[PDB]
Amino acid sequence: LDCGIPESIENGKVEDPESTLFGSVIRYTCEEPYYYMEGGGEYHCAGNGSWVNEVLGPELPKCVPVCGVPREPFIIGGSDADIKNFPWQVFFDNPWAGGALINEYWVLTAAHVVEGNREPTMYVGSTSVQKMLTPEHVFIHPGWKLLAVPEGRTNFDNDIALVRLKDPVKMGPTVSPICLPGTSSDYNLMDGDLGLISGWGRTEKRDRAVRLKAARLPVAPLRKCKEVAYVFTPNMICAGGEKGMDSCKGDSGGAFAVQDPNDKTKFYAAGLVSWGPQCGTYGLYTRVKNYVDWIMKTMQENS
Ligand SMILES: *[C@@H]1O[C@H](CO[C@@H]2O[C@@H](C)[C@@H](O)[C@@H](O)[C@@H]2O)[C@@H](O[C@@H]2O[C@H](CO)[C@@H](O)[C@H](O)[C@H]2NC(C)=O)[C@H](O)[C@H]1NC(C)=O
Ligand SMILES: O=S(=O)(O)CCNC(CO)(CO)CO
């Protein structure tokens, strides 16, 4: 007749129970607004002594991260940004680069960032580069050309990699994932579509930025990037061309964040900073939509 004090769950809590006896009810709530429940979270104390929920039975709820919604709305020619504006931003200190958290155990980045560093040290939650995440394994896309001499690379096709983390990342005001693009035609970018870039790369005034910078740039026809040999493919998005705003050395791997077409309050990773012919002109970004199948397969098979 006593179900006992209910067990807590990670990233959520159980409201203080009024009673733990037969017929009492308790409710689990996730830690909002950073997490949501994977129910309604209500359990009653059943006659067999278990706390039971209509959908989960005696199993406890799972709180999963909310993706793509910064706590505070918001690189050459950019401006100071707070990590709260781009909570999905990840910093790699060797080589100096970025990435995007896509869930509690995975970070998306450019293959060129991790090709020579299969155990990358990564940092999240701070506006300045001056929490450390530990990698479990780095998965480089199989279409990435590995080179004996990476400097001088001219073929950045398929510049994408995933980093699986050893421990789950705790979400909060400064750390949260960005959404992925869907596979429908609603995720086909068009000329002029606006996206945000963020990073600690070179600026017009310093070789690298100590504090996060960001800029809003429009997508442009691939021809623009070509008119600034290097390989250009449909797996690349061209963006920039306005007010000298562009991503630069040290920003590689960061997400080109675009407002989700179905939900204006969230951002998704439409591109990843890859390379560019000349800082301050047009830049090339890996087109994330083209890799969604591989990203999902990799995460599912390595869970
Ligand atoms: C006790 O029972 C639940 C199922 O709850 C009973 O049935 C329910 C509709 C509501 O009438 C409750 O008040 C009843 O007590 C067990 O639930 C099952 O748990 C197994 C695995 O353990 C799970 O495979 C089945 O899906 C669950 N069933 C459904 C209805 O939720 C529960 O295991 C029991 N606890 C104990 C100790 O035997
Ligand atoms: O399996 S996925 O990589 O998600 C789809 C194929 N992507 C390519 C990349 O060159 C086409 O855009 C083919 O590997």
UniProtKB/Swiss-Prot annotation:
Keywords: Calcium, Complement pathway, Disease variant, Disulfide bond, EGF-like domain, Ehlers-Danlos syndrome, Glycoprotein, Hydrolase, Hydroxylation, Immunity, Innate immunity, Metal-binding, Protease, Repeat, Secreted, Serine protease, Signal, Sushi. One of its GO terms (biological process) is proteolysis. Its main location: secreted. GO terms for molecular function: calcium ion binding; identical protein binding; serine-type endopeptidase activity. It is found in: Secreted; Cell surface. Disulfide bonds join 3-45, 30-63, 67-179, 225-238, 248-279. Residues 75-300 form the Peptidase S1 domain. The keyword rRNA-binding does not apply. GO terms for cellular component: blood microparticle; extracellular region; extracellular space. Core component of the complement C1 complex, a calcium-dependent complex composed of 1 molecule of the C1Q subcomplex, 2 molecules of C1R and 2 molecules of C1S. The C1Q subcomplex is composed 18 subunits: 3 chains of C1QA, C1QB, and C1QC trimerize to form 6 collagen-like triple helices connected to six globular ligand-recognition modules. It is linked to Complement component C1s deficiency: A rare defect resulting in C1 deficiency and impaired activation of the complement classical pathway. C1 deficiency generally leads to severe immune complex disease with features of systemic lupus erythematosus and glomerulonephritis. This is Complement C1s subcomponent. The gene is C1S. The chain holds residues 358 to 683 of 688 of the full protein.
